[PDB]
């Protein structure tokens with residue numbers, strides 16, 4: 001299925017996932033589409049921070065739910 | 076080289092503030108730029124992180140590059156003027172001593188503080204930079220530690236929300252990067268929400284309102300769980 005990842009800037013990144021996919025897997029997917037490593041990523045689904053090895057279906061995340069990406073960058 | 080880099084994480088920044096000896100604040104991460112934060116008021120400042128593309132306002136300029144996280148945060152705190160907020164002895168003594176020093180000399184003094192260097196390092200080629208936004212009297216200022224002076228972005232009030240000016244400046248800064256650049260982070264420095272709920276809870280307790288006390292317990296528990304996930 002497809003789900004949407006929104007960013008601070010307003011951009012919307014679309015992903016090919018299945019409800020079985022781990023959060024960590026979704027982060028791997030954001031890398032190849034964007035360039036940002038998993039390290040620098042936190043995913044929020046209204047409105048908890050999501051745990052790396054704990055599945056979309058686990059968080060009740062559907063076909064075309066929208067998630068939010070925030071960045072952990074070393075300044 | 077003797078200062079580590081610091082991750083753009085609202086939990087780390089909340090702890091750095093406390094580490095510097097300042098009480099009454101916390102840091103909240105912003106997730107969208109249209110996020111209404113009316114409920115987070117007062118907002119004491121913003122901390123903004125982006126990729127570096129190479130008299131009433133307190134401001135220090137950096138003389139070391141890797142200090143930018145602590146320096147941006149301190150530039151924000153030393154412009155805070157609020158009953159909610161106590162800077163603590165370390166930061167008050169720093170501000171008093173450096174009151175008539177030029178901006179780069181302030182950076183030097185900050186850099187030589189052992190307490191500040193200690194706190195900073197206890198939390199740690201594209202370069203990512205932190206800058207601060209803060210209101211002072213009727214102006215709104217961007218405090219970029221690479222510049223020699225604060226940058227006035229605009230004027231505010233009477234009705235005014237100062238945050239509109241800052242957010243406008245930040246959006247327009249984002250419009251300078253590839254429409255595909257997404258590596259930014261925005262945090263707001265706000266009053267301690269747990270402390271706010273505990274004050275209200277003790278008042279409703281005194282008023283005999285069990286229902287409101289329980290709901291405040293729920294808010295507090297929610298706040299604690301959120302703080303724990305940031306750990």
Ligand SMILES: *NCCCC(=O)OC
Nearest residue numbers: 075140141143203204
């Ligand atoms: N994030 C560490 C410091 C970088 C900075 O000062 O960029 C100019």
